[PDB]
RNA sequence: ACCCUCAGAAGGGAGGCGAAAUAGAGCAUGAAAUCAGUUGGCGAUCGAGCGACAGGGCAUACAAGGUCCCUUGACGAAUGACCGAGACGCGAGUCUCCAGUAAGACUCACGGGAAGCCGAUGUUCUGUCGUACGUUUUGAAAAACGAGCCAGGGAGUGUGUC
RNA sequence: CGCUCUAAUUGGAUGGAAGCAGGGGCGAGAGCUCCUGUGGACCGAUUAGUGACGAAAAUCCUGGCCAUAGUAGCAGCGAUA
């Protein structure tokens, strides 16, 4: 759940902003955002044997 | 009262006429810069070469003036490809056990940069006596 | 105020464009030229029509302006300019090393470049730049 | 802060510096630029004239809308920035002092080197309409000075 | 520390400590964007995808590249003469012979030279070509879409099964 | 070709590692290498592996920054001081 712990939502079109989920102005969750989630991170459920 | 480089600095390798021609050819035909398209219009774009991938790229489409595109045709001659401009064949050296097996008539040696002053000294003095020229010599005062 | 012309041409009774063309080519050969008797130069065709074309050139313009000559003086000089890349270093140079004069301010007599002469006995539809300049409203300073 | 960007033989030169001064960096470039080369004293006399409004300081770089001053020579714009001019005096004060505490003839000395540097901004905020506030900052300026025996 | 300066526990100067103060307080290193000062090239009569490839000017401490120029000669691919002689054509000009000769790019040798001199680097001038990039699109320089700049961040991943 | 960390084999560093700055050499190229200065403690090669592995772009994300500009505002309200 890293980076998924937020109710960040995107403002949509309207304020000359790119539709990126923001919370308190901070941009997030989304991978391309600092403090965002990891897109394809290492996974425990992986059989490394 | 002056600086002088250690080792055989003037030593020239001996090449077959052919290699000497091919070498000469290389140095005469040279090649294009091969810098990434428009690396010069944006500071965030670097000189390092990248394939123009743009569907409309002027360079990719091969428009004269937009620079050359990396192709095999530009390869240097097999026979001299990779030689120091002196003619020699460079040899990467990190210590003395590295000088063992080198032929000063064909190859010149290049002491790695990490190698310290103390070890360079041995390598420089040794390599000299084996007839091997060192490309990055130490300039002492005599 | 003195012009060391390596060549002095006599326009008098000579097809303007044709003189222009040669004087142009020559100045591009480093030659310094001086066209003399500009006002007595000739151009073929139907006066009414000709004069109509130059009148239009006088009327054309806007705030950026299209300054167009009326004196036979220079344009003749303009005609020459139009055969010279006057906006390139070289070009401007050549052009600037050429001058057109009314009558002849020199002691020598300009020569008559080949092919440029118009024989008045076999032609009747031609005009004098002076005739043109007069119509254009220019003051007959010559 | 800054360090002297220029060499100085201690035997024929005196130094001085202003630090994080809150004054126009733009006015500083101008004043500096304008007094470089003058004699420490001439410099003072000069700034005094500026602070007093009898000698304008040419604004060649930062001059949008600046009105032409007839006393400016070889140029049109600029103004008489007292504040920054004054700060420079405190500098020449310091400079000439050291200069003398060393045996030199401070005033008689030449302004070999003198340049202003934006050392940073003291940040501030100013409320605007629509529930939005924007920047409102003070420039923080450093300026080095070097005096050399003529 | 002390001393000087200053309205001054500020700041500045000098000075002391340490291998290092360009380790003096968000105090290891210290890029880019970018700012000040300054150096080189350009510059107040001249034209705009900013360049590529050529070739000139000016500029260059060492090191890590050492070549480059002119006489002559040798070799000499494709190509390929002048002149002279003879002969055709109204003519512009052509044919035959001299002759596949002289010439001919690269390279090498002799002799002479160059050290800002050759490479190279910065910049500027000339020649040729040249209306970014990525996307959308039959068709983009586009009066279609995206970005002010730079740095760092940013997209084929796991399990099961076939 | 380049990046991480693991392993085997094998190297370099206080007689100065990585990093960074400017510069020289090699490779068609990804990129490799050296010199000088800075830096002051780490760094490789090969081989087999391991990927949270390569950006110019997304009105992309965060941070810093320039022009805008010494510009607009610091006047307007029946309370002109
Ligand atoms: Cl290959
Ligand atoms: Cl007009
Ligand atoms: Cl032109
Ligand atoms: Cl007729
Ligand atoms: Cl500012
Ligand atoms: Cl050859
Ligand atoms: Cl894929
Ligand atoms: Mg996170
Ligand atoms: Mg760039
Ligand atoms: Mg104004
Ligand atoms: Mg409100
Ligand atoms: Mg620091
Ligand atoms: Mg359409
Ligand atoms: Mg091994
Ligand atoms: Mg990255
Ligand atoms: Mg991309
Ligand atoms: Mg304005
Ligand atoms: Mg009142
Ligand atoms: Na939370
Ligand atoms: Na598992
Ligand atoms: Na005509
Ligand atoms: Na007109
Ligand atoms: Na201006
Ligand atoms: Na004046
Ligand atoms: Na004036
Ligand atoms: Na050049
Ligand atoms: Na698009
Ligand atoms: Na496009
Ligand atoms: Na269009
Ligand atoms: Na934006
Ligand atoms: Sr080193
Ligand atoms: Sr001709
Ligand atoms: Sr300005
Ligand atoms: Sr000190
Ligand atoms: Sr032959
Ligand atoms: Sr990634
Ligand atoms: Sr600003
Ligand atoms: Sr008021
Ligand atoms: Sr109002």
From Swiss-Prot, chain A:
It comes from the Archaea. Residues 42-49 have a biased composition (Basic and acidic residues). Disulfide bonds: none annotated. Residues 1-49 are annotated as: Disordered. Belongs to the universal ribosomal protein uL4 family. One of the primary rRNA binding proteins, this protein initially binds near the 5'-end of the 23S rRNA. It is important during the early stages of 50S assembly. Part of the 50S ribosomal subunit. Interacts weakly with proteins L18e, L24 and L37e. Has been cross-linked to L18e. This is Large ribosomal subunit protein uL4.
Curated annotation (Swiss-Prot), chain B:
GO terms for biological process: DNA repair; translation. Residues 38-64 have a biased composition (Basic residues). Keywords: Ribonucleoprotein, Ribosomal protein, RNA-binding, rRNA-binding. Residues 1-87 are annotated as: Disordered. One of its GO terms (cellular component) is cytosolic large ribosomal subunit. One of its GO terms (molecular function) is DNA binding. The keyword Coiled coil does not apply. Residues 8-21 have a biased composition (Basic and acidic residues). Part of the 50S ribosomal subunit. Interacts weakly with protein L15. Binds to the 23S rRNA. Belongs to the eukaryotic ribosomal protein eL32 family. This is Large ribosomal subunit protein eL32. The gene is rpl32e. The chain holds residues 96 to 237 of 241 of the full protein.
UniProtKB/Swiss-Prot annotation, chain C:
Gene3D superfamilies: Ribosomal protein L13. Keywords: Ribonucleoprotein, Ribosomal protein, RNA-binding, rRNA-binding. The keyword RNA-binding applies. One of its GO terms (biological process) is translation. One of its GO terms (molecular function) is mRNA binding. Pfam families: Ribosomal_L13 (PF00572). Belongs to the universal ribosomal protein uL13 family. This protein is one of the early assembly proteins of the 50S ribosomal subunit. Binds to 23S rRNA. Part of the 50S ribosomal subunit. Interacts weakly with proteins L3 and L6. HAMAP family: Ribosomal_uL13. This is Large ribosomal subunit protein uL13. It comes from Haloarcula marismortui (strain ATCC 43049 / DSM 3752 / JCM 8966 / VKM B-1809). The lineage of its organism: Archaea, Methanobacteriati, Methanobacteriota, Stenosarchaea group, Halobacteria. The gene is rpl13.
Swiss-Prot record, chain D:
Gene3D superfamilies: Ribosomal protein L22/L17. The keyword GTP-binding does not apply. Keywords: Ribonucleoprotein, Ribosomal protein, RNA-binding, rRNA-binding. GO terms for cellular component: cytosolic large ribosomal subunit. InterPro entries: Ribosomal_uL22, Ribosomal_uL22_CS, Ribosomal_uL22_euk/arc, Ribosomal_uL22_sf. It comes from the Archaea. This protein binds specifically to 23S rRNA. It makes multiple contacts with different domains of the 23S rRNA in the assembled 50S subunit and ribosome. NCBIfam families: PRK04223.1, uL22_arch_euk. Belongs to the universal ribosomal protein uL22 family. This is Large ribosomal subunit protein uL22. It comes from Haloarcula marismortui (strain ATCC 43049 / DSM 3752 / JCM 8966 / VKM B-1809) (Halobacterium marismortui).
């Amino acid at each position: 759940y890293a980076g998924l712990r937020t109710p960040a939502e995107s403002f949509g079109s309207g304020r000359g902003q790119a539709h990126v989920p923001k919370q308190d102005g901070r941009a997030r969750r989304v991978p391309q955002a600092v403090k965002g989630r990891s897109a394809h991170p290492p996974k425990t459920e992986k059989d490394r044997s | 009262t002056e600086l002088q480089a250690r080792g055989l600095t003037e030593k020239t390798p001996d090449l077959s006429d052919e290699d000497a021609r091919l070498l000469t050819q290389r140095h005469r035909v040279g090649k294009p810069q091969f810098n990434r398209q428009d690396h010069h219009k944006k500071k965030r774009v670097s000189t390092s070469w990248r394939k123009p991938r743009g569907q409309l790229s002027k360079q990719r489409r091969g428009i004269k003036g937009k620079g050359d595109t990396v192709e095999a045709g530009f390869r240097s001659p097999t026979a001299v490809r990779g030689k120091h401009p002196s003619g020699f064949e460079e040899v990467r050296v990190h210590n003395v056990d590295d000088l063992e097996g080198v032929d000063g008539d064909t190859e010149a040696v290049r002491i790695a940069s990490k190698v310290g002053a103390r070890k360079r000294e041995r390598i420089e003095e040794e390599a000299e006596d084996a007839g091997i020229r060192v490309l990055n010599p130490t300039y002492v005062e005599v | 105020a003195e012009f060391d012309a390596d060549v002095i041409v006599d326009a008098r009774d000579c097809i303007m464009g044709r003189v222009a063309s040669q004087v142009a080519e020559q100045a591009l050969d480093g030659e310094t030229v001086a066209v003399v008797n500009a006002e007595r130069a000739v151009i073929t065709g139907r006066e009414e029509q000709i004069v109509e074309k130059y009148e239009k050139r006088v009327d054309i313009g806007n705030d950026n302006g299209y300054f167009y000559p009326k004196r036979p003086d220079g344009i003749f000089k303009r005609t020459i300019r139009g055969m010279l890349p006057h906006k390139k270093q070289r070009g401007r140079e050549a052009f600037e090393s050429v001058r057109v004069y009314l009558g002849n301010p020199y002691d020598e007599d300009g020569e008559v470049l080949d092919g440029t002469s118009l024989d008045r006995l076999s032609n009747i539809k031609f005009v004098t730049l002076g005739e043109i300049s007069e119509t254009l409203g220019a003051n007959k300073t010559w | 802060g800054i360090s002297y960007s220029v060499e100085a033989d201690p035997d024929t030169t005196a130094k001085a510096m202003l630090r994080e001064r809150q004054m126009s960096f733009k006015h500083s470039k101008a004043i500096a630029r304008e007094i470089k080369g003058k004699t420490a004293g001439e410099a003072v006399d000069y700034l005094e004239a500026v602070i007093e409004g009898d000698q304008p300081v040419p604004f060649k770089q930062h001059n949008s809308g600046v009105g032409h001053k007839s006393k400016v020579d070889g140029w049109d714009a600029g103004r008489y920035p007292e504040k920054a001019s004054k700060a420079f005096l405190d500098l020449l004060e310091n400079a000439v002092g050291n200069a003398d505490h060393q045996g030199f003839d401070g005033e008689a000395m030449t302004i070999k080197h003198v340049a202003a540097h934006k050392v940073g901004e003291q940040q501030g905020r100013k409320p605007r309409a629509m529930g939005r506030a924007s920047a409102w900052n003070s420039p923080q300026v450093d300026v080095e000075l070097i005096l050399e025996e003529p």
